[PDB]
Every structure is written in structure tokens, then in C-alpha cells.
Design an enzyme around this catalytic site. Sequence first.
Site, mmCIF file in Angstrom:
data_model
loop_
_atom_site.group_PDB
_atom_site.id
_atom_site.type_symbol
_atom_site.label_atom_id
_atom_site.label_comp_id
_atom_site.label_asym_id
_atom_site.label_seq_id
_atom_site.Cartn_x
_atom_site.Cartn_y
_atom_site.Cartn_z
ATOM 1 N N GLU A 67 3.456 -96.487 33.707
ATOM 2 C CA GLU A 67 4.829 -96.303 33.217
ATOM 3 C C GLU A 67 5.089 -94.907 32.664
ATOM 4 O OE1 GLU A 67 7.373 -98.035 33.584
ATOM 5 O OE2 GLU A 67 6.586 -99.946 34.294
ATOM 6 N N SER B 25 14.124 -100.236 35.062
ATOM 7 C CA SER B 25 14.279 -99.243 33.982
ATOM 8 C C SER B 25 15.592 -99.469 33.189
ATOM 9 C CB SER B 25 14.160 -97.840 34.574
ATOM 10 O OG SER B 25 14.031 -96.859 33.579
ATOM 11 N N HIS C 145 6.456 -94.952 37.223
ATOM 12 C CA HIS C 145 7.711 -95.609 36.982
ATOM 13 C C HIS C 145 8.636 -95.531 38.213
ATOM 14 C CE1 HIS C 145 11.568 -95.592 34.504
ATOM 15 N NE2 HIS C 145 10.995 -96.764 34.278
#
Lengths: 533, 535
Positions: free
Chosen positions: A324, A200, A437
Site C-alpha cells: 500500500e 482508495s 496501491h
Amino acid sequence: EDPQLLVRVRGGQLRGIRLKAPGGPVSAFLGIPFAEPPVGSRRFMPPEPKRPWSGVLDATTFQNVCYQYVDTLYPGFEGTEMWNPNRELSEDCLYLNVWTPYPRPASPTPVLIWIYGGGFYSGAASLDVYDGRFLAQVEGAVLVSMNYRVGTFGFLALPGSREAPGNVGLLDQRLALQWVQENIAAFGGDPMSVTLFGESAGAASVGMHILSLPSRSLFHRAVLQSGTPNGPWATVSAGEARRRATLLARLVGCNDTELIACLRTRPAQDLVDHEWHVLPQESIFRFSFVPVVDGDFLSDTPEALINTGDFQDLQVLVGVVKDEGSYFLVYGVPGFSKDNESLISRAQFLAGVRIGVPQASDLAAEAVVLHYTDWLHPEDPTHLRDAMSAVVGDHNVVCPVAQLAGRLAAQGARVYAYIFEHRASTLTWPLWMGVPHGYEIEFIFGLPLDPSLNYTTEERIFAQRLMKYWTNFARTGDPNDPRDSKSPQWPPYTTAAQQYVSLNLKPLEVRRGLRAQTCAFWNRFLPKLLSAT
Amino acid sequence: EGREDPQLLVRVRGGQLRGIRLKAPGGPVSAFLGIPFAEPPVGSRRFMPPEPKRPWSGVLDATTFQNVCYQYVDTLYPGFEGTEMWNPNRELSEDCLYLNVWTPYPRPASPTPVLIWIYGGGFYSGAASLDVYDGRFLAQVEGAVLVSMNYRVGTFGFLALPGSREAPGNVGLLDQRLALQWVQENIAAFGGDPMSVTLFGESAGAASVGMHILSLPSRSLFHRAVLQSGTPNGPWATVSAGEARRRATLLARLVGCNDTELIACLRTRPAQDLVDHEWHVLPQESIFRFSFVPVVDGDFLSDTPEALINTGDFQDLQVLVGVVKDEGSYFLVYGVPGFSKDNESLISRAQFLAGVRIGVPQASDLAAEAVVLHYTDWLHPEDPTHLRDAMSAVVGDHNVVCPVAQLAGRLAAQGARVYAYIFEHRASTLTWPLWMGVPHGYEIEFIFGLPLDPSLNYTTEERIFAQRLMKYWTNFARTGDPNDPRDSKSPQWPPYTTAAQQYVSLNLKPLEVRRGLRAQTCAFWNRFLPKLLSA
């Protein structure tokens, strides 16, 4: 006094702790200072190298977590607590950790440097999911992780000024990288084989070290998991940084010099109190203080830098997870909860889109809606819910990744891409979020190898595979097992073939085109639409 | 009268007719060919609405096809059947307002459902006398009464100075309407049931059928409608009043010419001069755009077809609509560089971007980019076969498939019983190259039952397929339902609905039901693209 747990680095002596990994011992050196604490007058300033120290520095425990916003939306919930700071918050946080094999590796070992995510507003190298013991034991990896300043402390910029130049969190990372070059040999690490990996914001940081010349001499290979330096959330322009900084200054009672000096008088929690009040619109996947295109660390925008850069002698591994965008929907999209199934309406969907693509004009929003509606089932709530997820994931992660992969491959890099598709059996988020995520990290780090953690046997074998890909990649720039057949092989990503692999319980499957039609939409068309107001 | 066939003498409102006994494969049929339904629209009558045919004396000979309306004749490929089959097969003349009737032989005892064919040809060409429109098979095999009419095309049928008295526009539509009136008054004389009249047409004929659905004075003249590969809505079937004024005055300039003076001058021009300059008045380089087409006059068409389909009540309407698999392929060889009937037409990306500008001539730079973006296969963006096929798809989707989807959806949502098809079988006898797939127009010979003629070289499967199609069409004409009421061992054809969007494949295999008529792509053309022209 175990002589294996005693190391002399350039600033003096350290004492690690012997830790147990399920298959053997590992030497761990936790909480090593790599910079002067950036406190008082040093707030917002570039890190300075840590002064030498007398005697033996105790490095057996994780140091403080950098001062940050803490998430309290779902208190007591594992799915959120696992990302929360697990040590005292403090501005005095510039420390790194090193796990090595026990005994200390015989010959120079490849080094993996982990950079956590957290939106540039949170995170810590001490979280259990970033535990470097497994990789160190099973694979013989020297594993390093650093703390870097997040939020205002790391990223508040009054661009052009000398006392708050921005990107200091990235400079913290770069300094930890410098520290590794200078000291990692003492631990049996090879300074000549350093692989960055990060997820990330950690991924966007890795990308920024790729795109910043002074960082390039500090590592040889890179892994970017679910994030990129390009794309809508990772950077801001000098102007928008100045604006947010002055607005935050105004919000807390505060000429650059004067303004910055005033901000330095404020308790840390005061800055954090107003962190989330400078965003230009109601949005998700958008963050107040992030690296700034400063003409310095970042000589141009990431987009510009990846378009024109030369990436000849660089290997990169990039990838995304299957979902995601699900995670973020509960943090500000009406109709979404982790507690029900968030079967939304059509109208909630159009509104969701103005939130997920905050910068979108009416027409742009319309294009997004029209593209992501399933026109056979335009009202079906499952589809609309899944679509909202996809919009957020594609726009912020998958498409920026496809774009990065394409540019690096075009401009000479060796690129390997993946999509991660296994939902952890222990996950406490609801089913509809799929593979959210950040839920590949525990697998890459090797956590299923700890019998106490209640992962299935299949998951434990999966983890072993991922650890192998990652460290093979660290070793050679190529994730494939360099003595093995009939697997099949993970092929490099190229702009022609666009090949990538699915990572899940089944063996590697090669697929072509990473959301190729939909990313054409985000990457080629949508910009044209917005560059008409 | 005296020595001739008693089944071939019929009286209609204008006088007496002698028809001809024709051979179909399964036995004889009555044909009455070249019945005049209007005063010849010649001299001072050019550009003017048709007037009913003044009654005649004696027995009119109705045994041969009459003149074809004055039109442009395609000569791109001499000798070539793919083009020849559509070319006028009788004399070109402004004196062309005639119609044709085919009935069982002997003529049916009880009132028979009537099918009226309206030919296509982009509003610049066509003829009710072409071999593919031969009504004999539907007459002989299904006992249908089939009527087809010539109507004026090109300038003669569609040149308009909207507002004026002497060239009001839409007169070819009025020619069609007059023949519909002729059927109402006269068809019972042939054993036809004026209370059961189905319009069917293809391409511009389909658009025409659509205008009749949308124009009040036509509504009372038929009961059911078939639209094959054409709609009244869409980018080519109509022009604004302003644009028709523009095209008509430019044409006038090109031939050396207030409205009265101009029209009067146009009336002194030889027909061939008008045809020679017909193609010189289009605003851009384009395909699937024709100079003189129906005009939104606020009269025949009270508003745009889009407006009227969006807000109309279609309570009482049964409509069958469909498309061929490759609506676009045909047009590519006419005006898109890189394309030919004589080679594989593997084009480049550049020839694609150029093709899109021509095929979507009304597109801004942004819009064309959107089209190119949507139709590019991003895995293989330079692949010539894909680019070729995408170019076809762009043209087909934009002009036919998406307009049909739009039509079907709005009609369904507003009371109509709508049946939907995609025709997918390529004639074994097709002379167009294989890449063109099943092009625009190549379902017609099947619906009309030409494969039933042993001497035409169709396969047996094709003969059986034609019969199936004829049954669908005439069941639909009989009942408002294409399905066979007894035989439900066959798979059923469900109505198209906004909820389920069902349609069927017509090919050699039994009916297959599919859902969504290019739903994603048509969302781009129908919902998104309009908004990208408001910015």
C-alpha cells in the site's frame, strides 16, 4: 439503427455503441448526463438532476473528465500516465457510463457501480483500467461508473454556508446512485441488487455511502479496495475545511457568501494552481479537499459512526494490496526514486516518518520508528526502505481496513477480507515497490483477458478468478463459487478468528489476523499517545 | 598438630586453619569452611562498613559452615523443596561475615585459577552454605579453587542514610569487597592464583558482580566476571540516595525510631524487628522489588549503573552473561493474583492488566497500557494460557532479560569481550509446576555440577550436560574464553557483538547459535519505555 443500442431512460432516449470484448459483443452507453453541469453559479453547489432532452442523445463516447490536478512528475511514464485524464478536463463532467451484455440481459441482472480513486483530487470513470466491457461480457454484469467532482470543485467547503456546504462530490456519486435506481431496469439491470465497489478514495466514498442514511437505500452490498472512510486522510473536520477554503480563497485574491461568489469568478486552473498549498504540514497521503464531517452527509466522524452503527443487513468485501505504501514515497520522501533502489539511511527513515505520519508528535514519531526498526539489522537500508513503505501503508490503509473490518463484523455485517499479492508482470514501477496501491484494479476489471495487452496465461486465469469473486459477491453477498468444491472456501472475516485470504496466482490460502500486532499499535496505542498533545 | 591430615592445615594472614577432607564423586577435596574475614558486624557495628578480621591465636576450626546473615525466611510453602532449597541452612546471626574455600586434594602444586561465587536472594536473603553452591564438584572435577562468602543482606547490609557516617549504604557490597581482598592476600596459601580471579554470581549476586565491575576499588581485585540472570542496571538492583533515605526513615518509624540519633536507635532494635518490618517500606504493591538494595551513593557507585555502563571503558574485560528461559515465572506466585504453584494459573485478561501494574510498579497508566499492548496476542487476546505466559514474560523481560541485553550491548560496544547465553533446560527433578518452565535460579545446580552426585536422581544426560557447563565456566575463568581450545569438533561459542548479537542456547543438545536477545521487545523496554516516563 441497432435496437439493442437504443434505450429510453427517464430523461429521454440514448444510443449506445456495440463494443467488442474478446469473447463477444457488449452494449456500452458512455457519457450519459446525470446532473445539470455544475458550472458558473453551480460551482461548489450540490448537483441538480439533469433536465429531460429532445431526440436521441449520443452515448457512444466518454464525456469530459472533472477538472483536476494532472500529475506531471514523470512525463511519458506508463506507471503515471495510466491514471492521468484521458479526456478533456471540464467542470461540465457529471456523466456516467453503463456496460451491459449484448444482447440486453433477459432477466434483471446484478449491477456493479464503480467509484474511482484519485485522493479525492483526481480520477475519471473513463480510464482503461475501469473498462467495464470484460465484466459485462464474461459475467453478464451490468456495470455502471460515474464521474464525480474532485478537488476544490467537489470538496471545498465553508461548512454551515448554503453555497459551499462541502461533500458535493459525494452528492454527485449519490445522485448517480439515484439515477441507477430510477433507470437501470431499462438496461436489464436489477435496481434491487446494486453492489458498490471502489478503490482508495473510491473505497472511502463507498464507506461514506455505508455511513450516510440517504445513500443506504441505493445499494445492497459494498466492496472497499485499499481505502476506508475512517483513518487519517479520508475526512477533515468542519474547522479544518473552513480553514483550508479561506486559505485557498486568500491565495487567489478573495462573509461566506462574498467569499464563495469570488471563488466562483475564478478560472478552474487558478483553484488547481493553489490546491496543493493549503496542507498544514509537509506530508504524503494527505489531501487538501476531501469529504468534510459536516453533521449532515456525515452526521458524526467516520470513527464515531462505525463504532456505533448497525450493520445487520449488510455484506462487505474489503482488502488491501501487499505494498500500500510504496508508491507514495517517491512523491516527497527524500531518498526515494522509482529510478534507483532507494536504499535509504537510518536518518532519512526518521525524517520519512515525520512526513508519513505528519500529525505525529516527537514521541509518537519515536514510537513509530522504534516499532518498525528491525533491531537485528537496525541500519540495513533494504529493511529501512521496506519499513518506510509499511509505515505509510499501515497507517493509511491496512490498519484503517483492519479496524473497519473489525467494527463491521462486531456490529452485524458479513465481511470478507483479502490481501492482494500478485505483482502484474507488465508493471513499469521498480521491483522494490512490490505490489503498489491500485495494481489489482486491472485484474478485477478483467484486462488480462485482452490478448493485445501481454499479460501471461496465469494472469489471465487469475483475472477470471477475481472477476468471479467480485461478481459472485455482487450476486449473493458471498464471493465463493456457489457450485464448486475443494478450493478452499473464502471464510467470512470475524473479530474472533480474523480470517482473510491472499489473492495471488496460487489458490486461496486462509490467513488469520491482518497485521494484528502492528494494527494494535496504530489502532489502540498511537491514539492514546497523541491525545497527550 | 601431630596426628592430623597434613593437607588440611593452612596459614592465612589472620592465623592458622584446619580444613576438612570431603568426598566428591571422583575423589576427595579440601574444604575450608567458615573462615572469618571481618570483625563480626554486631552491636555498634550494624549498618557500618566491615573491618578486617582481627588475627586469632591457635588453630581455627574451618570444617563447618558458619552462621547465615540475618534474613527473612520464606514460609509460604512448608515442606516444599522448591522453596526450601533456598532457605538458610545454618543459624541466623548478625555474626555472619565468613567465607569458604574448596581446593583440589591434595592442593594444587602450581597456581590455580580462582572462581569466587556471590549468591543471590534479592539482597534480602542468601547464604554461601546452600547445597546448590557446593564448591566440591568444580574443585574435584576441574581442579578449580572456589571461594564463596556470606555478605550482609536486607537492612543490615543495605539500609542507608546516604551522607551519614553511621549508615553510609552498600555495606553488603563492602563485605563482598573485603572477601575479594582476603582472596588477593590469602588465596595463594591454598594454591590459588590471585592473578586469575573470576567473579560469578546469580540474580543479586550477578547484580553484585556488576557493581564490582563498575566500582574502581573492586576492579583491581578480579580479572573476569560472570553475571547469571542479573545486572547492576535495571529497575531493582539499585535505589537513588533519596529513595534509600525515604525507605530507611520509614523503617525507623515502623520500629519506633539528625541521622546519628536514628541510626543509634535502629542499632538498639533486635535483628528480628528489622526483618519483620523490612517488607513494609516499598512505594507500591510489587514483585521483583526489594526494600534495601545497593544505593547510588556517589561513592561505591559514583553514578547510576546506567550512566556508568553507557560511558565506561571496558577494554580489559571478559564477561559471560545470560538468562534462563523463564525469568519471570517464579515471582508470579508470590504476589500476582490468579497465580499458583498448585494449579495451571490460567488467568483472565483482567488479572493480566492487574499483574502488569504489580510487575511494572513504576509505570504510569500510559506505560502499563504500552506493556499490555505489546504483550497482548491480538489474535487470541483473551486466551488464558497466552496471558499467563505473557505475564511471566513481562516480569522476566523487564527485570532480567532486557537489562542483560542492555548490559551486553553497552559492554560489547565499549571494548569488552562478552559471551552470551540463554539457559533452556528444566531440571528433571524440578518441583515447580511445568508452566513455570525453567525458572530463575535453576541453572545453578548445573554449573556447580550437582548432577555428578549419583545419589541426586539427575538423568545421565544431565550429568553430561553439567560437565559441559562446568567446562564452559572454568574455561572462561582460565582463559576469558568458554570454548575448549583443542576440541573444535564441538560447535563454537562466538562473542556477543553489537553488529551480530550472537548468543548460545544451553540445553541437552549441542550449542546452537542464535541472533538478537529478544531484540524487538528489548527495544521497547530499553529504548522506548524510558521516554514514556518523560511525558
